Amino acid sequence: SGFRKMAFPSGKVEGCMVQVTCGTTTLNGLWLDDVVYCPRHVICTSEDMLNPNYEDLLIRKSNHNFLVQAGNVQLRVIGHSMQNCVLKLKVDTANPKTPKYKFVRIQPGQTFSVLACYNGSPSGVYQCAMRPNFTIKGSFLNGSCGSVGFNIDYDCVSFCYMHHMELPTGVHAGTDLEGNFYGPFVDRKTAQAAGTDTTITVNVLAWLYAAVINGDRWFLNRFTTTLNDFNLVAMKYNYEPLTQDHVDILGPLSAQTGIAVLDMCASLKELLQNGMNGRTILGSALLEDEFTPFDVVRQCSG
Amino acid sequence: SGFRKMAFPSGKVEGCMVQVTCGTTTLNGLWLDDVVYCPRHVICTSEDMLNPNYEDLLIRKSNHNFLVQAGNVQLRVIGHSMQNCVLKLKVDTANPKTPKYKFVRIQPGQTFSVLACYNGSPSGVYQCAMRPNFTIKGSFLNGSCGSVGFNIDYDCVSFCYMHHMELPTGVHAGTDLEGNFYGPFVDRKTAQAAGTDTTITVNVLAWLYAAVINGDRWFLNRFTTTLNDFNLVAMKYNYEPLTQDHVDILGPLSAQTGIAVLDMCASLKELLQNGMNGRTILGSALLEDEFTPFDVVRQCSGVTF
Ligand SMILES: *C(=N)[C@H](C[C@@H]1CCNC1=O)NC(=O)[C@@H]1[C@@H]2[C@H](CN1C(=O)[C@@H](NC(=O)C(F)(F)F)C(C)(C)C)C2(C)C
Ligand SMILES: *C(=N)[C@H](C[C@@H]1CCNC1=O)NC(=O)[C@@H]1[C@@H]2[C@H](CN1C(=O)[C@@H](NC(=O)C(F)(F)F)C(C)(C)C)C2(C)C
């Protein structure tokens, strides 16, 4: 029993974290085979943070301007290219700790683990979800940049996120490992703010199913709802609209518990109507939205 | 900025997890140098768990009774010994990934990282506190036994916990790596219950300090209390007493925020009496007590390797 916000073992990613330095800028790099991936804004001074021309700044750089350090070893840089907002440094050594990996772009709602690093040393690991507004509610200080988000599937590491910047509201923005930003952000210091956040409705229902399987039944009820009446009510609490696709994904938890998704939707509407009246679900007095249907099955049946 | 329940990187510890099988029981082992550590109750059958005679059950067992598997490779057991509630199996091979490590035993309120494992394969890492009643609120299914708790200080892994059992209340109990239980528990299937839990007061106050640092400041009030007067409120609300010791630990956070510890106590007191009056603190409707002062500093400022 028990239910924990639980990250993947960070071991396979720890073996890939290096320090990338350029001028007075030091941030973190991901060393896979003979390529170090890191945020391109490493090549910006304080000045060129406002309207950087990355193409112009990079053409000024030779291989020898990039100090790559893996623990003690300085890697020798033998090539640099840019792909979108990530800089790719070719090094003369393939990383011997390179795991089986892929690059994946995730959708809002998806969870992944973040290995927070400073100076190419891993600090800590925590579990994140991609918010509907394409930000993550992370924990990152100065020099954290180039810290990555990942999933692990059997022995394969799925890299989905590289950290770039903090927005004024304290939420974080970054790119996939092809360097395309999640959402409408750019690696410039400009007036840009996170859109209005919403609750990830599909995740809350999943978490309620976890509550049932872990033997908590105090919040259900005898009502059901139409998908439309559910969405019309939920949306007034800033909940993401639930789609037929979301219901389909809840098939397995519905079947395992024998509570139809629209029945559990009825429970949710009433929980929003009523709150907790003291009580808790799975040790929380808020409705948890950073557990996907997959995360529940893995932790409560695996 | 931001504040998360954050675990230590598990790499050094993932390199030490093995599978131990004795008869039809499989669980997890910790492989360090040429010894494998795992719960002694691996030797117990369903029958033997009700009234086990460990010294007797153990002496009836030869090394050939113990399958130790590191991935696909069999390790050869060349010796076996018991220390308190942990079985120590000498294996023919030293673990080449053995980190700098020591065994430490923690007090309630201290936090640590748990690496949950099944069949010697690490599944997940989460952050835990040793509860005041010496349980931990874990997430552990069948085969999780031999999952370890640790902290890291630079390159030294300090192992502090090995998982043994689930209490009927759904909370978890285990030992230090010398096999001494945390709390008044025994490794038999017999009926056991967690005593009544209390809230780790110093940790809430540390967490409230973490709130102030992230600009969540609404709960500050003008009032200050005294330790004596506060601790009377604490007891009523099933809160651990705040000691002179506890107050001194918070000096860094008091100094960093300019909020006196007994001032922060007044905010806390008022919160217990009044509730949160709608609001949340760092996105929680509950007062959080599983972040230590050291945990808060290692994330909100640095010292984070
Ligand atoms: C990488 N080391 C930091 C990560 C930041 C620092 C504080 N916590 C973090 O997660 N990244 C940066 O310094 C990026 C970098 C320029 C400015 N910047 C920011 O994080 C800033 N953000 C913005 O100005 C905003 F909102 F517009 F994006 C700041 C708020 C000053 C921390 C670039 C290229 C975005
Ligand atoms: C190790 N593989 C399991 C892990 C358990 C399984 C359910 N959740 C967990 O964390 N631990 C055990 O097999 C221990 C072990 C015998 C029985 N046991 C229990 O978990 C039982 N608990 C107790 O006996 C209790 F409550 F009294 F502490 C169970 C009835 C399954 C809850 C021994 C030696 C205690």
Author numbering:
A (entry chain A): 1 to 302
B (entry chain B): 1 to 305
Paper quotes:
Herein, we evaluated the effect of single mutations in the active site of Mpro from circulating polymorphisms on the kinetics and inhibitory constants of nirmatrelvir and ensitrelvir.
The structure of the Q189K mutant in complex with nirmatrelvir showed that the replacement of Q189 with lysine resulted in the disruption of a salt bridge between the NE2 of glutamine and the O atom from the carbonyl group of nirmatrelvir, dislocating the ligand position compared with the WT crystal structure and causing the loss of a productive hydrogen contact between the pyrrolidone moiety and the O from amino acid F140 in S1. Another potentially impactful resistance mechanism depicted here was the one caused by the Q189K mutant, in which the crystal structure revealed that the absence of a productive bond between the oxygen atom of the amide group of nirmatrelvir and the side chain of Q189 caused a rearrangement of the inhibitor’s binding mode, leading to an increase of 16-fold in the Ki value. Another key difference between ensitrelvir and nirmatrelvir resistance profiles is that the former seems to retain near full activity against the Q189K mutant.
